Design a protein around this ligand. Structure first.
Ligand SMILES: CC(C)=CCC/C(C)=C/CC/C(C)=C(\F)COP(=O)(O)OP(=O)(O)O
Ligand SMILES: [Mg+2]
Ligand SMILES: [Mg+2]
Ligand SMILES: [Mg+2]
Length: 530
């Protein structure tokens, strides 16, 4: 006597099911991009260029979403800028220099902001009329670490004056400022912010560089073609599983899952990774629905068991419907091994597998707590709820497709590094805040905010505030974990960073779909008009 599958159908239909790439256009773009790519490189390798202009060039190339073509050129430049400790006496260039360096790992000192502060250690209110300065200070305030108390007030300071000046600014600056106030650059999904910058800002910029803009538009549209194919291939794979009918309780959200994967990494070199990642997200999506929307305490107990043993032989031990899920799961991981066979990497799949078992264990626990009406203290709660975010698992899963991933990297990840923990906390803490009303007005009395309220004996307001600071602390920890020397290559940190970004974008508020729909249309449907 299970509950009624109230979930909603995919508003996408087969819109993505079949996509065929016009090879002519694709090659036309490719050929010109190569040319524009080289012209751009020469813009970077140019000499006798001022600091402010050099930083603006790098900032622009990054916002245009094409900096992944110049990881080395950009690096060398920021490196020398870091080492020359040059001091441009104005907020705007300082804040921009600060941010760019920190996002790239260079631990530049926040002492660069003192000249802009009074002896009391607070920003000179006289700066309130320098909109560009405030904007870059604003963006910079989001990349601070625990050691940057000098910037403790930058955010509120820049925020209040930007809101103040916004209405009377010209375009596209006005739109740019308003957009930053709603979404800072450092915590947004790269593709999303890049789509917005190219279309709503740089394209309306009078001073815009025609070469860069064209480069940016063609590159974004060319990569979109690859993305669309991937989503096509993944949509078919999902179709050839037919869970939409066999497992009616499970909701169809592959398109949204793919968006998530695209948020982790968008570059072409990570095409295989993305496809693997999205299949896992979709797959684990079912397991979730299975646990808190269809299975019985006894069936879930059996399910968690079979997952731990992980062997086809356990099938018969499971109910009929759970047989579909279980076999599908083992095959998926069997496919992963096959794809990695070609490069003798099938031996890493087990890391993702162990992380999945962990997610299952905790789902099962979450169920037991639900059934018993148990409300654990914050400490015990997080000990279980952190893994149920699925973040340790997705981060691990994101390495599977990365050619450069080695055992040492997974090794490092298995020890739950700070940066990963912070990304996981952010996801848990924000989901909890956003989903407190629901669930409450439902059984789940073990929700984070509830435990927090009972544990500390504080109101919902205060509990959400406490969770808010956990997320704040978490972001600072992430920014810290990006500073050189990094425990692993930066290439393996970005996915963790991006998982945290996705959380911020998906809950910038209602249901995720209504939040993701726009982004999905903007990244996988409408191309940027040239
Ligand atoms: C915000 C979070 C937690 C995850 C985002 C990344 C995704 C899509 C992971 C796959 C599993 C999952 C939690 C869902 F599909 C959504 O279910 P739902 O979130 O309603 O299930 P619960 O987290 O409440 O059990
Ligand atoms: Mg769930
Ligand atoms: Mg659940
Ligand atoms: Mg929730």
């Amino acid at each position: 006597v299970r509950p009624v599958a109230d979930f909603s159908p995919s508003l996408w239909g087969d819109q993505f099911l079949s996509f065929s790439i016009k090879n002519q256009v694709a090659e036309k773009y490719a050929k010109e991009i190569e040319a524009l790519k080289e012209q751009t490189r020469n813009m970077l390798l140019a000499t006798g260029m001022k600091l402010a202009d050099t930083l603006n060039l790098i900032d622009t190339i990054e916002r245009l979403g094409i900096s992944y073509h110049f990881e080395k050129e950009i690096d060398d430049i920021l490196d020398q800028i870091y080492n020359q400790n040059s001091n441009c006496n104005d907020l705007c260039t300082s804040a921009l220099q600060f941010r760019l360096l920190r996002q790239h790992g260079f631990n530049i000192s926040p002492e660069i902001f003192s000249k802009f502060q009074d002896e009391n250690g607070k920003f000179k209110e006289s700066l309130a009329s320098d909109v560009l300065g405030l904007l870059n200070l604003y963006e910079a305030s989001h990349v601070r670490t625990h050691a940057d108390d000098i910037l403790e007030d930058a955010l509120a300071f820049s925020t209040i004056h930007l809101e103040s000046a916004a209405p009377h600014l010209k375009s596209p600056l006005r739109e740019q400022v308003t957009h930053a106030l709603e979404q800072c650059l450092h915590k947004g999904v790269p593709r999303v912010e890049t789509r917005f910058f190219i279309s709503s800002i740089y394209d309306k910029e009078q001073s815009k560089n025609n070469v860069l803009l064209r480069f940016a538009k063609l590159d974004f549209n060319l990569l979109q073609m690859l993305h669309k194919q991937e989503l096509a291939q993944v949509s078919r794979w999902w179709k050839d599983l037919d869970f939409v009918t066999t497992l009616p309780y499970a909701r169809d959200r592959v398109v949204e899952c793919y968006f998530w994967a695209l948020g982790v990494y968008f570059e072409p070199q990570y095409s295989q990774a993305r496809v693997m990642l999205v299949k896992t997200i979709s797959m684990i999506s079912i397991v979730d629905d299975t646990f808190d929307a269809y299975g019985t305490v006894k069936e879930l107990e059996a399910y968690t068991d079979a997952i731990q043993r992980w062997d086809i032989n356990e099938i018969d031990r499971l109910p009929d419907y759970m047989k579909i899920s279980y076999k599908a799961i083992l095959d998926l991981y069997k496919d992963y091994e096959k794809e990695l066979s070609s490069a003798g990497r099938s031996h890493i799949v087990c890391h993702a597998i162990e992380r999945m078992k962990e997610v299952v264990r905790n789902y099962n626990v979450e169920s037991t707590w639900f059934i018993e009406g148990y409300t654990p203290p914050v400490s015990e709660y997080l000990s279980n709820a952190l893994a149920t975010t699925t973040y340790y698992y997705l981060a691990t899963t994101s390495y599977l497709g990365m050619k450069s991933a080695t055992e040492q990297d997974f090794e490092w990840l298995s020890k739950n590094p700070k940066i990963l923990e912070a990304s996981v906390i952010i996801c848990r803490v924000i989901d909890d805040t956003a989903t407190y009303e629901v669930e409450k007005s439902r059984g789940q009395i073990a929700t984070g905010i509830e435990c927090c309220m009972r544990d500390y004996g504080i109101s919902t307001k205060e509990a959400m505030a406490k969770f808010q600071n956990m997320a704040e602390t978490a972001w600072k920890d992430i920014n810290e974990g990006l500073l050189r020397p990094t425990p692993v290559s930066t290439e393996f940190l970005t996915p963790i960073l991006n998982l945290a970004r996705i959380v911020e974008v998906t809950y910038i508020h209602t249901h995720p779909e209504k939040v993701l729909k726009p982004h999905i249309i903007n990244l996988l449907v409408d191309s940027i008009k040239i």
